[PDB]
Design a protein around this nucleic acid. Sequence first.
RNA 1: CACGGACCAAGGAGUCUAACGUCUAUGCGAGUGUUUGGGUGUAAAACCCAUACGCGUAAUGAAAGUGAACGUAGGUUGGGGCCUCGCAAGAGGUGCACAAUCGACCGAUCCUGAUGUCUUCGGAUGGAUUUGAGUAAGAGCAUAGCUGUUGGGACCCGAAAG
Lengths: 148, 185, 54, 49, 37, 52, 51
Amino acid sequence: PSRFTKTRKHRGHVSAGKGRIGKHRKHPGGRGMAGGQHHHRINMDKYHPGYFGKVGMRYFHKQQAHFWKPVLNLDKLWTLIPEDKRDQYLKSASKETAPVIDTLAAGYGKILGKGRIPNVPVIVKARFVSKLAEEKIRAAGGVVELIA
Amino acid sequence: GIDHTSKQHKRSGHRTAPKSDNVYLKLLVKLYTFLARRTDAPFNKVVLKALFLSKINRPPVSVSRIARALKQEGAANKTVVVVGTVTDDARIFEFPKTTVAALRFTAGARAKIVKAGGECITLDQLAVRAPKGQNTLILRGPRNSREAVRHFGMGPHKGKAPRILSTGRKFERARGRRRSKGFKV
Amino acid sequence: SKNHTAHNQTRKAHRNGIKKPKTYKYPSLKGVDPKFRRNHKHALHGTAKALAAA
Amino acid sequence: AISKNLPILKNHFRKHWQERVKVHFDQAGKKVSRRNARATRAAKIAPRP
Amino acid sequence: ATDVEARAVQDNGESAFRTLRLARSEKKFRGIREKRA
Amino acid sequence: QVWGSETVASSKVGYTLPSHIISTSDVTRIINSSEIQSAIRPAGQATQKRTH
Amino acid sequence: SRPQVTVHSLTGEATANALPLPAVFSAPIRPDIVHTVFTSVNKNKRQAYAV
RNA sequence: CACGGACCAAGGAGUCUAACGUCUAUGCGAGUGUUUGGGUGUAAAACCCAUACGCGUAAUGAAAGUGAACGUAGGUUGGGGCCUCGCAAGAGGUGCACAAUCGACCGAUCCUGAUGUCUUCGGAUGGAUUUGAGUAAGAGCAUAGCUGUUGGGACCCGAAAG
């Protein structure tokens, strides 16, 4: 839709939208992030502070496959059971048959401890575990069994 | 001429009709302009103005925000009214028996309510149940919990986020962010 | 006058008005001395504890 | 010019990028041209998978 | 198949955070035991 | 069996037909009901006379 | 439940067996996205042109 | 008594794209995006779809790493609406969004160092005028539009040069 643009409303008016005193010209101020600490300094000091420097050590040949650990909180833990089965364990709540929840097959590398779970005993298989996320499982009669 | 106190011919900055072209929403405004003009009850002026609200100002009211709102003292038997979307939540486990009135329920939220003994009605079967707004409880969703509100007001010492594309220790941590490199804003 | 006039600056200040700072009840406690501020934390705590059992 | 409260953008269009752009109008034609040369291959090898 | 649906609970006294925390420092002080030996 | 129903689900995976914002489309038939009409103040003067 | 439509012959006379109206015929007839989804699906059979 | 214009016809200048900011519409909704590809076709259309992947659901730290409920997810003060009482004024109850303020919780920083101890590992607990683009009953993803941005010949025409 070029008929909706404001070039169509600007036919007739000399200096089409860009003023008469200071005209529209090709790059006043430089090309790109030019003048980051010379004349556009107080833009970069107000709106993007943290530019213009070097912090931290370096990691030669970083592979993001080592740092794969997608988290899961406890409040989303019963979603890994299918819905037609997850309510059956909520009603029965039997400890001799605690439903096995495998976090790694669902695709998670850590179970974290945000939220409260119901007091139903489950056993949870996970690579990595935080201290609350086992404390809230073992308080529910649950078992954390590490994997891989 | 006159010595103009305040600005002439200024539109009041409120919309009087939705920006949308939804025909099935234009009939809800044809219902609630009748109600709010021919009923002295102030509930109908609230739902009238709330049907004009844009999607940003009309955030989703999750099904735990509802189930919390019936834990108020003496508010179990109210009917909840949401003039946006009502979404599901898999963090709550027991849900009460109430009738919720809403524009759009999702699939997960509509299944959760009718499983728990409740029911889901639209905003036109509410008007035959409450023309004056008997025992309603208008809930609203959180507005400042967007992505775009963490960036409003970004300046020095404000505490807001930067508008940034990619994060990491190389992107916007060095100067002005720690006293080692220059200063700390 | 190519060097620092202040003509028209009072016109421009009074178009959007010169605004008062919106005094709130419960003003902040970021400048008050920390000895009082630490004990005021424990004073409001035991007040709510005593009004819990009431 | 660094202008307003906007993201810092990396746009790598300083080389002669207009000589090397491969627009895929072939996307419809090559699907027919692979569904052809599969059924040509499948009939060439007779029964075999 | 991974571990099958809904087996039984054998809660032992040790915790899984204590194991991951001990196994980490056992990796971290591998060599200083041989310097101490 | 293509677009599904309330009894037959759709042959398109994960699809339910869209649901209504408003249950009916004759808004005047829900205006002219028992509960609305007995809960409104009375009408008057589609165009009102010019005083003064 | 659903209204029963009449099956017609090849010659014109209304054959006795009736069919329930399906569930898609009560879907919301919203002409504001049929307008929007048309004018970006009517563009999907274009050929490029340039100088 | 500044510059352009002798007259007429036709041509003639904010476009397109990559990546984004705000706002709006629509679809779905803690999910979302079919179209690299496979199936199909009345054939560059349409229609159907498995795995992954993108962004989101978790932050923080240079990093090793740890990783979010003392409390009917808290206390106070405002707060639409609803409710109760009264003919009504008004009074009380509950108070979503939001705005102030005081806390709590996670991480870093600084401090305290309990059971046990491989004899120095472990880091419980309790802190602090510190700190974070955080938690505190999710709000996003995708498509479309105006305006704005940056690179691109970039509104069209123009150097002396290299």
